[PDB]
Design a protein around this ligand. Structure first.
Ligand code: C2E
Ligand code: CA
Ligand code: CA
Ligand code: CA
Ligand code: NA
Ligand code: NA
Length: 270
C-alpha cells in the first residue's frame, strides 16, 4: 500500500479509501471482516456512506482494533446541502459518534450547496464540533465548479470529484486547481457501472486485451496515477475484492497501456 498527504492537513491517507454503504446482505460480522481485511492490506481511510445498525456495529468494532490516530474516517452526508440543519447534526451524533463509538471524525463530506454559504444552523453546529475537537474538517463533493467563497471557509479541507478515463477537461482542471490550492481531493467513480460500455468503443480494446490485467484494474491503476488525488474511493463486497483492489496499488501500469489510454480518445474519434 502507498500513502499520500491529505492536502495540507498534515496527515496521510492510504491511496485507496474503502466506502462502506448500507446493504442488507452484509451483517455486522461481515462488515467487521471487510474492515479487518482492508486494514490488513494497509487501507486506513474509510468512508461511511450509510447508517444501518449492522454496518455501524461491525465497522465500529473493527475500527477499535487499531489506534484511532492511524485511521482517517469520513462520514458522507447525501442530503440536499441547502436543507441541512439541526436534524442533520442530531442524526450525526446518533449514527456517527454513538453508532461508530467515535470521539471525532476526520472529515464530513457534504454536497455542493451551489453558493458561497452553508445553511446557518448547520454551519454553527459544524463550528461547535470543530471547536470541540470532534470534527477535523469539512469536504465538498462536487461535479462542477465550487464557489471560491465556500472553499475559503475555514472548515473546508477537502473536495471530492469523479475521476476516470472519461473525465473531460473541466473536471481535470477543477481537480488540479483544488490540489494546487492545498485541498485534498478524493477521487470517485474510477470505473462506475454506467461507464463500462467504454470497453466496447473502438480505441479502447486494450481495456480487455492486455495480458494480466482486467479492465477494472486498468481503470483503478489509471486513477492511481493522477497526482492531484490524495486517495481513490473504492467499494468492495467481499474480502477477495478488497485484496485485489489493494494489490493494484503496488502494480505498475504497463507503459504501452498508458500510451494507449492517452491515444484512445483520438483513436475512437477516428
Ligand atoms: N463529486 C460528487 N458530487 C456530488 C455527489 N452528490 C451530489 N454531488 C454534487 O453536489 C451538487 C448538489 O447536490 P445536492 O445538494 O444533493 O442537490 C441536488 C438534489 O436536490 C437534486 N438531485 C440530484 N440528483 C437527484 C435525484 O436522482 N433525485 C432527486 N429527487 N433529486 C436529485 O438536484 C440537486 C442538484 O444536483 P446536481 O446538479 O447533480 O449537483 C450536485 C453535484 O454537483 C457525489 O456523490 N459526488
Ligand atoms: Ca440507511
Ligand atoms: Ca458562527
Ligand atoms: Ca457548484
Ligand atoms: Na468520496
Ligand atoms: Na466507490
Amino acid at each position: 500500500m502507498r500513502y499520500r498527504p491529505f492536502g495540507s492537513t498534515g496527515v496521510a491517507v492510504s491511496a485507496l479509501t474503502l466506502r462502506l454503504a448500507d446493504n442488507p446482505r452484509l451483517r455486522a460480522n461481515d462488515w467487521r471482516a471487510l474492515v479487518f481485511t482492508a486494514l490488513e492490506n494497509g487501507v486506513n481511510s474509510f468512508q461511511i456512506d450509510g447508517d444501518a445498525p449492522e454496518l455501524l456495529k461491525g465497522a465500529g468494532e473493527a475500527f477499535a482494533s487499531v489506534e484511532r490516530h492511524l485511521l482517517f474516517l469520513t462520514w458522507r452526508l447525501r442530503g440536499d446541502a441547502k436543507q441541512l440543519g439541526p436534524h442533520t447534526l442530531d442524526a450525526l451524533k446518533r449514527s456517527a459518534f454513538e453508532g461508530l463509538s467515535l470521539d471525532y471524525l476526520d472529515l464530513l463530506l457534504i454536497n455542493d450547496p451551489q453558493s458561497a454559504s452553508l445553511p446557518m444552523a448547520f454551519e454553527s453546529g459544524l463550528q461547535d464540533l470543530q471547536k470541540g475537537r470532534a470534527l477535523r474538517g469539512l469536504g465538498v463533493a462536487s461535479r462542477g465548479d465550487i464557489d471560491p467563497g465556500l472553499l475559503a471557509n475555514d472548515l473546508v479541507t477537502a473536495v471530492s470529484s469523479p475521476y476516470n478515463l472519461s473525465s473531460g477537461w473541466a473536471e481535470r482542471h477543477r481537480i488540479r486547481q483544488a490540489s494546487q490550492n492545498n485541498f485534498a481531493v478524493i477521487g470517485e467513480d474510477f470505473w462506475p457501472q454506467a461507464l463500462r460500455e467504454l470497453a466496447d468503443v473502438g480505441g479502447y480494446e486494450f481495456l480487455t486485451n492486455t495480458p494480466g490485467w482486467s479492465a477494472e484494474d486498468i481503470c483503478l491503476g489509471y486513477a492511481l496515477t493522477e497526482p492531484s488525488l490524495a486517495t481513490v474511493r473504492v467499494t468492495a463486497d467481499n474480502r477477495q475484492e478488497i485484496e485485489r483492489l489493494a494489490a493494484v496499488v503496488e502494480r505498475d501500469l504497463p507503459t504501452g497501456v498508458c500510451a494507449q489510454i492517452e491515444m484512445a480518445r483520438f483513436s475512437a474519434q477516428e
